[PDB]
Design a protein around this ligand. Structure first.
Ligand SMILES: Nc1ncnc2c1ncn2[C@@H]1O[C@H](COP(=O)(O)OP(=O)(O)O)[C@@H](O)[C@H]1O
Ligand code: BEF
Ligand SMILES: [Mg+2]
Ligand SMILES: [Zn+2]
Ligand SMILES: [Zn+2]
Lengths: 411, 132, 98, 119, 208, 67
């Protein structure tokens, strides 16, 4: 089996797909149960009628995924169903190869559990697991469309790369030199999709009836209607009266998901008996917690502080090189104007002699990371990088995870 | 027409540098004064002589205030406090201005035309001197 | 304050070009002005410029093609330091003339 | 920002901060407390202020205007945005620029043949 | 106008300090025992950092049922005892075999497994790994991870030197209005307008 | 007397009271050392000189001028 399987394990969603296909198959990672007791599969959560009361229980914790039984069952569902995903199927997988993505700071023991489950249970001939930041230097192997932004202006892989990956679990700033991450300068940002969703549920709980019971509705609103302040919180606050969005609640008897309505857009003349929620301050207030934590009352340092500290732990020679090449991945970067705002706020704190450049790919950044992660398989270096099954049977289970796939060896 | 070069921006950190050598000329002085300047496009640190720093001390400049320093005449002018610091206090006397655009250093020339009689009147009445 | 709107944009200092010269007799003498004007340090800055122009042109004529280019200056170990050196000595080239 | 001052506290310089003070501006509709800005404290200590009088403090101008004692009653919200129209003749504009202080030359009649270039 | 002459007492007046001040009203007095004993026995303060971590984790949690269990995990991440910091700070299962059978009925529609098994030590370890039912706190309590490993994974990742770079922004607690910054009397909280003040006096003022 | 200054030494607390410091004036074709008197010690303090400098001293009135 020449083409391998590319599986990206996230906390919110796990993207799995073959190396031949251009786009990954999106499958949520979670187990949801209704108040009545009915439990539905992760991909079937979108099909249910009533989103009012839902309890989310997922195998992935904040740090890592502790339970491999539910995650293994999700793997059996995604990989073992030919009819659920068009054209995809696997009879066994003894000859197929797997490329996985795990957290950089993941515990070694849970990594042993992962290697034992994937190697022994799934009978994969060869598997190579690396964090998403390591596949970023391989973006230059193939030609693709990626948007470049200059903060100062008004083999195939590359050595110097700075990977800022925002995620549903948390945001990680990982410097990469010579295709290897530098783990002393890696910084962790506790801000993530969970803090934005919960924060929006608290703000909406003070402004209106408490929505904390419904996570999915607040998540959909946060995805659809949220935007980042292009200039500053003050300029966006003086314009909060001009820029406003009205969201109508989906009625369980009629519409499952609500629709965003702009007062400037007359395209929706249809009247309804439902009541509309006004959104003004929460639009630019929620995303601003990254740069300024003081709006959310949290004491966190902020993103740019972690960037400057990450550059502080690096050698003086590699600092101006890594600020010239920056790739942004994850779902939190899909918000509009966030890239240019981050490039400007970072440019203001950098010296005049140094020029900062940020390259954000067009479209969804997660799908981009999966695409480049699939292009890593086509690289001739993957043939030397992959580990054979017999070598894993010879060495102990702790050696494969501790040496080649572990962060402790690169420290 | 004459060309002038100006450094402008918000003051980040300014520190005096005193020489341990007495030199016999003075009892106490400073060798140089380093004042950092912040602007939207970039930041730069400058090395200044004690006189132009004494002018800054006359302007009563503090960390976080935008200043205007011209190289030709060596005059220092304080425009005002930076806009981001305005939220610090509820009531404030000082005006607030945004941070200046431009990297730090700027090169510009002034083509202003002036009649000869205006040179004569400006020549008759001096504007200079602090004398009572 | 309305008449204090931006001036030095289009304003000339007019005291830097010595058209105010009627104030020069108070603290300044004749022979000190003649000797002070005869002793000027000009032609030394031209030498300090010409000696650096060699180190500038040896980098420009050889590595100057890919040096200041942002493409080769994106990721390079050796070239980027040369770019910062050239852009460093250009500032010292114009500064001595100012 | 205008209103009655019930309580104003001002503290001497300490190592912790240059000066710490809190003034209480009470109005009929809203009553809030502001923490002074240093030189604001120099304006309150500059002219003696007694608690219980109605004053109007100018943020942009930086000076205090006392409208009476509590003679008047608080109208409403503390901070309000107002526009101030000033009617000034061409002569009054012309005299100020020709002199160091020209407004005195308006009243004193010493103006003495302003240059035509200024006009 | 300004009085050029000012009467002053030698003992009472000081140039240092300047002070001016003016059914049944009663000064608010807290009847709490732990508040009075706490008062008599005593850049951000450490307790406020604890409140920021507790509130950050309560806002981080997805479900109500998981809210009470989080402060134990956060207390394990901080290192301070759980009961003490949980009692001092006021904030604001997953797996079942039958449910697993229900999921087996969910994916039972289409599957292509081939069962093969042979008894081996690696298969015993396989059955031990597949069935875990262990919380992350249980893994943190295990000795399998090194102490330096835990320090590097948790304590060493956060930024030590830089607490703040960008300037601070203070906004109202209701609508976040920065145009009028006005602190409340009782709680010292900043309120922009009279409407946000009247809305603040009811729900959001605890110390009143 | 016009020339560039090399080094200026003035003793203060070694003994005291105008200890007769000596300064070295340099010209391109000539260099000499001059003894400094008490009144010249007092006069050199005004218009302070760090040396590394070109100054001119009047012979008749002892006036110090800094070029
Ligand atoms: N178009 C969008 N607008 C706003 N947020 C989005 C958008 N698309 C995805 N997200 C956010 O990104 C998150 C998904 O991140 P993901 O790529 O799954 O990271 P992980 O690797 O942690 O699973 C979701 O929680 C969602 O809130
Ligand atoms: F695990 Be995800 F990338 F936050
Ligand atoms: Mg991810
Ligand atoms: Zn408000
Ligand atoms: Zn209150």
């Amino acid at each position: 089996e020449t083409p391998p399987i590319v599986i990206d394990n996230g906390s919110y969603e796990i993207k799995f797909g073959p190396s031949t296909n251009k786009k990954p198959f999106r499958a949520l990672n979670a187990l949801a149960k209704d108040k009545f007791g009915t439990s539905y599969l992760s991909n079937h959560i979108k099909n249910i009628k009533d989103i009012s009361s839902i309890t989310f229980r997922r195998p992935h914790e904040l740090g890592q995924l502790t339970l491999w039984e539910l995650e293994s069952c999700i793997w059996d569902y995604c990989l073992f169903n030919p009819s659920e995903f068009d054209g995809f199927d696997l009879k066994e997988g003894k000859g197929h190869h797997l490329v996985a993505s795990e957290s950089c700071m993941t515990l070694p023991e849970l990594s042993k559990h992962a290697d034992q489950v994937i190697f022994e249970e799934y009978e994969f001939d060869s598997l190579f697991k690396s964090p998403v930041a390591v596949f970023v230097p391989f973006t230059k192997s193939y030609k693709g469309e990626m948007r470049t932004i200059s903060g100062k202006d008004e083999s195939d892989y590359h050595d110097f790369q700075l990977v800022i990956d925002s995620g549903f679990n948390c945001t990680w700033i990982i410097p990469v030199l010579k295709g290897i991450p530098y783990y002393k300068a890696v910084k962790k940002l506790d801000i993530g999709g969970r803090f934005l969703t919960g924060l929006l549920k608290e703000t909406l709980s003070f402004r209106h009836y408490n929505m904390m019971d419904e996570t999915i509705l607040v998540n959909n609103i946060k995805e659809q209607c949220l935007f980042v302040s292009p200039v500053s919180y003050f300029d966006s606050f003086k314009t909060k009266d001009k820029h406003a969005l009205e969201y109508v609640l989906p009625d369980f008897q009629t519409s499952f998901l609500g629709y965003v309505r702009n007062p400037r857009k007359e395209n929706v003349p249809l009247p309804e008996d439902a009541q509309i929620i006004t959104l003004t301050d929460e639009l630019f207030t929620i995303p601003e917690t990254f740069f300024h934590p003081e709006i959310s009352q949290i004491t966190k340092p902020g993103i740019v502080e972690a960037i400057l500290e990450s550059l502080s732990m690096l050698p003086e020679i590699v600092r101006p090189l890594m600020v010239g090449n920056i790739v942004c991945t994850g779902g939190n970067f899909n918000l509009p104007n966030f890239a240019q705002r981050l490039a400007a706020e970072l440019q203001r704190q950098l010296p005049t002699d140094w020029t900062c450049h940020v390259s954000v790919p067009e479209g969804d950044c997660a799908l981009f990371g999966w695409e480049v992660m699939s292009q890593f398989a086509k690289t001739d270096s993957y043939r030397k990088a992959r580990v054979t099954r017999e070598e894993y049977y010879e060495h102990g289970p702790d050696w494969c995870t501790k040496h080649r796939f572990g962060y402790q060896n690169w420290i | 027409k004459e060309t002038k070069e100006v450094y402008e921006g918000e003051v980040t950190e300014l520190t005096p540098e005193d020489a341990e050598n007495p030199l016999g000329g003075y009892g106490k002085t400073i060798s140089h004064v380093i004042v950092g300047l912040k602007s939207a496009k970039g930041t730069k640190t400058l090395r200044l002589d004690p006189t132009i720093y004494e002018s800054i001390q006359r302007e009563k400049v503090s960390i976080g205030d935008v200043i205007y320093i011209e190289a030709n005449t060596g005059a220092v002018k304080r425009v005002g406090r930076s806009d981001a610091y305005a939220t610090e206090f509820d009531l404030e006397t000082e005006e607030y201005v945004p941070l200046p655009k431009g990297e730090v250093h700027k090169k510009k020339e002034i083509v202003q035309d002036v009649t000869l009689h205006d040179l004569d009147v400006a020549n008759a009445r001096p504007q200079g001197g602090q004398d009572v | 304050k309305l008449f204090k709107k931006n001036n030095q944009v289009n304003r000339v200092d007019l005291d830097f070009l010595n058209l105010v010269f009627t104030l020069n007799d108070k603290d300044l003498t004749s022979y000190h002005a003649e000797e002070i004007s005869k002793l000027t340090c000009v032609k030394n800055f031209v030498e300090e410029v010409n000696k650096l122009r060699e180190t500038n042109k040896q980098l420009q004529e050889e590595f100057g093609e890919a040096s200041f280019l942002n493409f080769q200056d994106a990721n390079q170990y050796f070239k980027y330091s040369n770019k910062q050196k050239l852009e460093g000595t250009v500032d010292m080239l114009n500064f001595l003339k100012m | 920002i205008e209103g009655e001052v019930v309580e104003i506290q001002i503290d001497r310089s300490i190592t912790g901060g240059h000066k710490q003070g809190k003034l209480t501006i009470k109005t009929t509709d809203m009553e809030t407390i502001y923490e002074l800005g240093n030189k604001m404290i120099d304006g309150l200590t500059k002219e003696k202020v007694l608690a219980g009088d109605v004053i109007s403090i100018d943020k942009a101008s930086g000076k205090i205007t006392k409208l009476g004692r509590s003679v008047q009653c608080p109208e409403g919200e503390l901070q309000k945005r107002k526009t101030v129209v000033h009617t000034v003749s061409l002569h009054e504009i012309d005299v100020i620029n020709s002199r160091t202080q020209g407004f005195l030359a308006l009243f004193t009649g010493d103006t003495g043949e302003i240059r035509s270039e200024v006009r | 106008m300004k009085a050029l002459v000012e009467e002053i007492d030698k003992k009472t007046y000081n140039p240092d300090i300047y002070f001016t001040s003016l059914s049944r009203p009663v000064k608010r007095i807290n009847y709490s025992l732990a508040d009075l004993e706490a008062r008599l026995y005593t850049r951000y303060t450490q307790q406020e950092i604890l409140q920021s971590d507790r509130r950050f984790m309560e806002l981080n949690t997805e479900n109500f049922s998981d809210l009470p269990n989080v402060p134990t995990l956060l207390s394990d991440l901080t290192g301070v005892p759980r009961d003490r910091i949980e009692s001092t700070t006021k904030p604001i299962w997953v797996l079942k075999p039958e449910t697993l059978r229900e999921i087996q009925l969910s994916y039972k529609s289409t599957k292509l497994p081939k069962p093969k098994r042979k008894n081996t030590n690696r298969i015993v370890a396989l059955k031990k790994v597949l069935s875990s039912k262990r919380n992350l706190h249980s893994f943190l309590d295990s000795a399998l991870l090194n102490l330096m490993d835990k320090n590097v994974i948790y304590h060493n990742v956060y930024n030590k030197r830089y607490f703040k770079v960008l300037p601070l922004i203070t906004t109202c607690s209701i609508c976040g209005g920065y145009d009028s910054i006005s602190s409340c009397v009782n709680c010292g909280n900043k309120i922009c307008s009279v409407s946000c003040f009247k809305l603040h006096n009811e729900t959001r003022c605890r110390n009143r």
